[PDB]
C-alpha cells in the first residue's frame, strides 16, 4: 500500500548536478517528512538531511555544505533532491524515505518506507549499454531433469543492469549474479534459471534486461 | 554527533538458533533506537522503533531491550529468509546517526553444487568473442575453486567468476564463472572443461563440451 517510487539510476560527470525524485502513494504526502540517506557501494548508511512535506523547511547535513537540495510538489506527491557539483567520492545509492518526526516529541520517530533507490555513479567514462547473449540449455546443461539457461549481459557502464524472466513471471529458481569487471572498465554479468528439462519445448524463457543509464532494454528469448 | 557502534560485524548461526546484536551509543539517548533489516539487493526496512516496538507486519521472533547507550536486538529462532545486514539508529538528535551493520549469515549442511557449462552463442561468435559460462548451483559453504581448461590445458587469463548473496529460502550459494576468448583462440582448439572443488566433493568434477 504505502510505497515510495524513485527516479532510475544515472551517471553524472565529476562537477555536474543531479537530481533525483522520488514519488509516494498510499499515504498523505503532506503529513510526513522525506528524509535523503545515500549508501557508498561497500559501507553503510548517511543522512543528507530532509524536507516538509507541509512546510517547505529542509534541514541538511553539515558536510554537503550548499550542494544538496530538497523540494517537494504537493500536487504530484513527489520529492526531489539534487547535489550539485558532483564528486568522484559521490557515487553510491541515494535513498529517499517517508519520516516521522512531529511537533510531538516522542521516540516514535523513524524512516519507514524507504524507495527502492537510486545508483548514482559519478565518472568522466561515456555511457554504453550491454550487449545481451542467451545461454542455451543443452545436455552439457542437464542433471537430473534439470536444465539450466540463461542471458549474458555483457559490456556495460555504469551499472546497474535489472533482469527478468518472463516479464516477471518466472522468479523461483533465478539467479542474477554481481557484476564483474572486465580488463577493460566494462561490467558484465549472467542470469540463469532452473527449470524442468521435460518442459523445455513446452515452456517460452525470454530475459527482460533494462540499463536505464542508456536506457536500454534488450529482450531476448533463450531457447534450447 | 552521537557514534552508534554495533558489537559484532558478523556473525553466523543456525536455522533455530536465538541470535543478540548489540548496538552501543556515545551518549545517552534514552529510547530513541531504531532497528533497520537490510537484505542484499533490496532497501533497508523498519523493524523496531523506540527500542521495542515491533512494526505490524514483523514477525515476533524479533525484539528489542535496553535504554541509555546500550540496545539489543534479539532474534530468539532464526530463520533463512533473516539473511541480512541489521543497523541501529538513534532518533535522539539531528543527524540521526546509523551504526555500521551486522552481518548476518545462516549456517546449513553441506551442499555439492551442480555443475553446469554453456558453450558461446552463434550471436556472439559473429562478433569475434567467445565467452564460455560454468555455472555452479546451490552449494554450501563459499569455498569453490573453478579451474578452465582448454584441452586438458590449464588457462590462466581471462577469467571472471562471481558469487551470490546467500539464498533467502535454502542458505546457499551459486557462483558464474566466464572464460572469454577472441573468436580466433575458441577455434585453434576442441574441448573446453570446467574444473570444480567444493568441500560436498570427493574430488574435483569436470564438466566439458566439444566446440
Ligand atoms: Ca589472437
Ligand atoms: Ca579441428
Known amino acids: 500500500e504505502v510505497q515510495l517510487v524513485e527516479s532510475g539510476a544515472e551517471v553524472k560527470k565529476p562537477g555536474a548536478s543531479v537530481k533525483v525524485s522520488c514519488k509516494a502513494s498510499?499515504?498523505?504526502?503532506?503529513?510526513?517528512?522525506i528524509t535523503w540517506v545515500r549508501q557508498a557501494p561497500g559501507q553503510g548508511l548517511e543522512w543528507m538531511g530532509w524536507?516538509?512535506?507541509?512546510?517547505?523547511?529542509?534541514n541538511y547535513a553539515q558536510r554537503l555544505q550548499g550542494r544538496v537540495t530538497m523540494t517537494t510538489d504537493t500536487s504530484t506527491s513527489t520529492a526531489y533532491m539534487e547535489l550539485r557539483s558532483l564528486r568522484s567520492d559521490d557515487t553510491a545509492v541515494y535513498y529517499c524515505?517517508?519520516?516521522?518526526?512531529?511537533?510531538?516529541?516522542?521516540?516514535?520517530?523513524?524512516?519507514?518506507?524507504w524507495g527502492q533507490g537510486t545508483l548514482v555513479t559519478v565518472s568522466s567514462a561515456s555511457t554504453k549499454g550491454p550487449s545481451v547473449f542467451p545461454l542455451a540449455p543443452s545436455s552439457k546443461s542437464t542433471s537430473g531433469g534439470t536444465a539450466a539457461l540463461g542471458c549474458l549481459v555483457k559490456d556495460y557502464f555504469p551499472e546497474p543492469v535489472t533482469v527478468s524472466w518472463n516479464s516477471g513471471a518466472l522468479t523461483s529458481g533465478v539467479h542474477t549474479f554481481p557484476a564483474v569487471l572486465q580488463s577493460s572498465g566494462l561490467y558484465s554479468l549472467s542470469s540463469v534459471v532452473t527449470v524442468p528439462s521435460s518442459s523445455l519445448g513446452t515452456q517460452t524463457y525470454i530475459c527482460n534486461v533494462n540499463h536505464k543509464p542508456s536506457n536500454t532494454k534488450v529482450d531476448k528469448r533463450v531457447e534450447p | 554527533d552521537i557514534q552508534m557502534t554495533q558489537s559484532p560485524s558478523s556473525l553466523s548461526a543456525s536455522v533455530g538458533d536465538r541470535v543478540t546484536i548489540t548496538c552501543r551509543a556515545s551518549?545517552?539517548?534514552?529510547?530513541?533506537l531504531n532497528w533497520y533489516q537490510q537484505k542484499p539487493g533490496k532497501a533497508p526496512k523498519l523493524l523496531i522503533s523506540?527500542?521495542?516496538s515491533l512494526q505490524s507486519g514483523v514477525p515476533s521472533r524479533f525484539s528489542g531491550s535496553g535504554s541509555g547507550t546500550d540496545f539489543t536486538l534479539t532474534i530468539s529462532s532464526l530463520q533463512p529468509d533473516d539473511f541480512a545486514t541489521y543497523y541501529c539508529?538513534?532518533?535522539?538528535?539531528?543527524?540521526?546517526?546509523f551504526g555500521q551493520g551486522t552481518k548476518l549469515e545462516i549456517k546449513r549442511t553441506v551442499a555439492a553444487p551442480s555443475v553446469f557449462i554453456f558453450p558461446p552463442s552463434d550471436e556472439q561468435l559473429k562478433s569475434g568473442t567467445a565467452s564460455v559460462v560454468c555455472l555452479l548451483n546451490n552449494f554450501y559453504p563459499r569455498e569453490a575453486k573453478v579451474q578452465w581448461k582448454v584441452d586438458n590445458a590449464l588457462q590462466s587469463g581471462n577469467s571472471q567468476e562471481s558469487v551470490t548473496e546467500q539464498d533467502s529460502k535454502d542458505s546457499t550459494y551459486s557462483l558464474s564463472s566466464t572464460l572469454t576468448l577472441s573468436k580466433a583462440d575458441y577455434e585453434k582448439h576442441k574441448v573446453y572443461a570446467c574444473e570444480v572443488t567444493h568441500q560436498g566433493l570427493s574430488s574435483p568434477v569436470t564438466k566439458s563440451f566439444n566446440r
Open positions: 551518549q545517552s539517548i534514552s529510547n530513541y
Open positions: 523506540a527500542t521495542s
Open positions: 524515505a517517508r519520516a516521522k518526526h512531529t511537533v510531538l516529541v516522542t521516540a516514535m520517530r523513524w524512516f519507514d518506507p
Open positions: 539508529q538513534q532518533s535522539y538528535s539531528t543527524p540521526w546517526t
Open positions: 524536507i516538509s512535506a507541509y512546510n517547505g523547511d529542509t
Open positions: 498510499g499515504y498523505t504526502f503532506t503529513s510526513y517528512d
